[PDB]
Design a protein around this nucleic acid. Structure first.
Length: 52
RNA sequence: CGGAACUGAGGCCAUGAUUAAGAGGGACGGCCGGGGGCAUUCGUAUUGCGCCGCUAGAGGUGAAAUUCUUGGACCGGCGCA
């Protein structure tokens, strides 16, 4: 029961927190507070070499 | 009689001081300014430290490595110095 307030229109908010720069890129979904995290992901966990 | 030193009272002179620098000094009035010294309050950032959460990479390069990394890095969060 993940957000059991079932109305099929009650949208559930989060925040994303993109940290972009050179040599990296992060995507860090969290709740409204930034205290609880949901699947932080990067660019280095997908490609093979370090210059891409 | 001359010229010496000294002391007293008087009338006379149209009776005596050049102006005030587009030279300067000082005074006075209202302002002006990241001018100078002493004490005072504020700011985000950085670095470290503590506690919480999820997860394998993070840095840095033209490209790499030295280096940090499940004994929990980098990211996010609240505090403190």
């Amino acid at each position: 029961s993940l957000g059991p307030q079932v109305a099929e229109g009650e949208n559930v908010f989060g925040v994303c927190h993109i940290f972009a720069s050179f040599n990296d890129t992060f995507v860090h979904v969290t709740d409204l507070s930034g205290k609880e995290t949901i699947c932080r992901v990067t660019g280095g966990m997908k490609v093979k070499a370090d210059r891409d």
